[PDB]
RNA sequence: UUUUUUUUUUUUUUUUUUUUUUUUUUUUUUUUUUUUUUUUUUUUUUUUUUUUUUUUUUUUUUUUUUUUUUUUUUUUUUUUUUUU
């Protein structure tokens, strides 16, 4: 809701909660995916 | 100026004491007797954008005064007399 009000995300492409639950289940089970997105977070955090 | 006083008269050898007499080996005790592993817990469950205001409105030259007028020479005293 916060990003929709900021107009950063177009709400037309909104995935259903059925798909989000399936993806979240995959994200929790697998550590390899988590490590990749954590690595992205650290690199993006570094400014410059 | 000066006028006194300003030698000396005692005492001053010595007489005691001053070796020594005790004690001074030893007699205990002196190994040891316990205990000495362990038994819990130890992931997580919230929140985390924003909503106001934010130019200015006055005043801000000057008006006075600002020369001077007195006084301003002088009039005393100023050797010495003792003692030593």
From TrEMBL:
Query: Where does this polypeptide localize?
Result: Virion; Host cytoplasm
| Transmembrane residue ranges | none
Regarding protein family, the annotation reads: Belongs to the paramyxoviruses nucleocapsid family.
Q: What does this protein do?
A: Forms the helical nucleocapsid (NC), protecting the genome from nucleases.
Tell me how this protein assembles: Homomultimer; forms the nucleocapsid. Binds to the viral genomic RNA. N0 interacts with the phosphoprotein (via N-terminus); this interaction allows P to chaperon N0 to avoid N polymerization before encapsidation. Interacts as N-RNA template with the phosphoprotein (via C-terminus); this interaction positions the polymerase on the template.
Q: What is this protein called?
A: Nucleocapsid
Q: Which organism is it from?
A: Henipavirus hendraense
């Amino acid at each position: 809701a916060k990003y929709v009000q900021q107009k950063r995300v177009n709400p037309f492409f909104a995935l259903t909660q059925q798909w989000l639950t399936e993806m979240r289940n995959l994200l929790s089970q697998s550590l390899s995916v988590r490590k990749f997105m954590v690595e992205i977070l650290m690199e993006v955090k570094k400014g410059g």
